Symmetry: D2
Subunit: 171 residues, 4 copies
């Protein structure tokens, strides 16, 4: 069977970097891959070309008979139907690697990532450097600008990575 | 802060064994612990330590003391999803939490409480079992072999086997 | 090929316990094993029956054509010829699991364990609870009774596990 | 105390890449670092950071400051085995040390300096490469394909390939 590896953690933790490392492993082995990201900028960069898609059901079109690995970034933004699509790929012998956030900036679970963590054969929790104390112990994201909304695409203009004690102090 | 470690995997994969190893670590260090299991058909034993048997996660609070350093919770799949917020509060108070539970039902649906705790976790340990069909150390699923289709159904080897994905798919055909 | 897993750390770190866990995995799978310990008490207990042997060369006698795993405890006490004997087993498709101390109580390397760490496919460093501070951070063994000699079979009557800061404080 | 992390494995397995990831972690935290590589045919680059090029491990001491928090050493197989005692002293002073180097020569003999550092390590990270022969992510060995039999012989892909054990044994036959 295929194996599912889920890469998760807060922002700035190297999730996309690790996902791309796995893509390179497969390419070096001359194993066919399919790389996806949710919706139009086709670049996965921390780069490889990715298929930008709205729904997990759309992945089927791009998966060929000798596809060996499927790589999906920003999984927290996909519909939870991703769980059954991924189960089907594993059942077909295809390895799947997913990267995405585990928690929102308000420490609520991202549903789709949670479901994939339950299906995973391997889970890699990534850490970041804490923006406040500088230790390699950041497991949370704190929102520093913009509104309080939990869906808000952005980078350093809106978000920092913090450890739990720094998150609680700053709040 | 406290750290959350979630130990998960199918049946027979050594989850309670690992949870008990962590309880021993804290006890050896003379750190106070609190150990919990759900009420649903007092010892946590892999084959063991005594545990508080509780219904609601919020009941843990009755047993957590000022100097409690570690909280250990077995069979987390059977707790109400409010366990997520109870655990977060413990971590914020500097208490380390170790949870063990199944990730997937025998139908390969997520156990939602375990899934929420995986989201919160600082460290996730996926455990494997020996596959009942092929003997490889590659079993990641549980298959139900007696007792009807219910996903909440307490039992052991009379009811459930650990299998790898290929073997699960073979046996289901 | 076979894979080599080396389990190392100070005393009281669960090395033998982990080695026995792997033995059980193989037995549950109905895979033939051969279990060795250096020299006459044939028990490996933290139990399974072990072959008690003087030299690594003696392992050959006990290894059958359908042996799938070889398990060796207290490797620090074996001759460094163990490195080539283990390489040969891996070459034959046999998995090997070794447990042993990495450092003496004087923080000198055990030669045989060092050589096996270089050959290993996987290394598991085990920790103990520090006898002094109670944290799960002990990586060293300190000798508390008997003489200063570096070869001295014993348990709690002679040795404690400590973290690096506690070792330095106590010395 | 400081902790020692040793990253090891055959060529092409991402050892320097991982070492550089750790250097970045410390730099992001505004922690002073000291980075070293051996003199033997200034940048550490995986493809990078500037490094002090030194002969003897004891030369590191010239560059380590009062507020140095992390020491990073690449190609440790090429250093004198006294590196073991130099590193122990750094750990005792509270300085974290990260070493990357080959575990085995192309003849599958141990690199002794790496072996000593593996003994001392708090954490060991064995890295794998893609096998040049079969394409699986299972290469744990390096095989020499040009340049005579010497075990101290600087070079890259013109001289060395990463292989799995079965492929190494096949190619050697
Ligand atoms: Mg990303
Ligand atoms: Mg259990
Ligand atoms: Mg032992
Ligand atoms: Mg390098
Ligand atoms: Zn912080
Ligand atoms: Zn199976
Ligand atoms: Zn201590
Ligand atoms: Zn190969």
């Amino acid at each position: 069977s295929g194996k599912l590896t889920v890469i998760t953690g807060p922002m700035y933790s190297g999730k996309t970097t690790e996902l791309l490392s796995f893509v390179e492993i497969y390419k070096l082995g001359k194993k066919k891959v399919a790389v996806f990201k949710p919706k139009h900028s086709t670049m996965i960069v921390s780069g490889v070309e990715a298929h930008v898609i709205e729904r997990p059901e759309e992945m089927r079109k791009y998966i060929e008979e000798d596809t060996r690995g499927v790589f999906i970034d920003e999984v927290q933004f996909f519909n939870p139907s991703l769980f059954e699509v991924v189960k089907d790929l594993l059942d077909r012998g295809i390895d799947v690697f997913c990267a995405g956030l585990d928690l929102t900036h308000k420490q609520n679970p991202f549903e789709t990532t949670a479901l994939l963590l339950s299906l995973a054969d391997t889970v890699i929790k990534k850490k970041a450097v804490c923006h406040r104390c500088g230790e390699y112990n950041a497991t949370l994201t704190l929102k520093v600008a913009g509104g309080e909304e939990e869906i808000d695409v952005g980078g350093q203009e809106k978000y920092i990575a913090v450890c739990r004690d720094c998150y609680n102090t700053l709040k």
